[PDB]
């Protein structure tokens, strides 16, 4: 069922409308998606690639980019930011 973001991830999620301290992973992905879209962090030509250098997201995930297709690795990056 539920996960507890650490403070900085929680700040990211709350920046795109999230209201809670705990979430399902699907809600986490949902708000993270809103974030990526609002900040236009994905490559306009190869839209699976997210560029997160010099963004809060990149600080959290510890990478300068990643591929949306790498589902398991994205979970790894999020789980670094769960209590």
């Amino acid at each position: 069922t539920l996960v507890r973001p650490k403070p900085l991830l929680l700040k990211l999620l709350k920046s795109v409308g999230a209201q809670k301290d705990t979430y399902t992973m699907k809600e986490v992905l949902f708000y993270l998606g809103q974030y990526i879209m609002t900040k236009r962090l994905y490559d306009a030509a190869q839209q699976h690639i997210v560029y997160c250098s010099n963004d809060l997201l990149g600080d959290l995930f510890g990478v300068p980019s990643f591929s949306v297709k790498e589902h398991r690795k994205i979970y790894t990056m999020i789980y670094r930011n769960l209590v």
Binding site: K26, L29, I36, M37, H48, V68
Partner: peptide
């Protein structure tokens, strides 16, 4: 695909 189409696969 579009970003959102890739993201939806992830979300599902």
């Amino acid at each position: 695909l579009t970003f959102a189409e890739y993201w939806a696969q992830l979300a599902s």
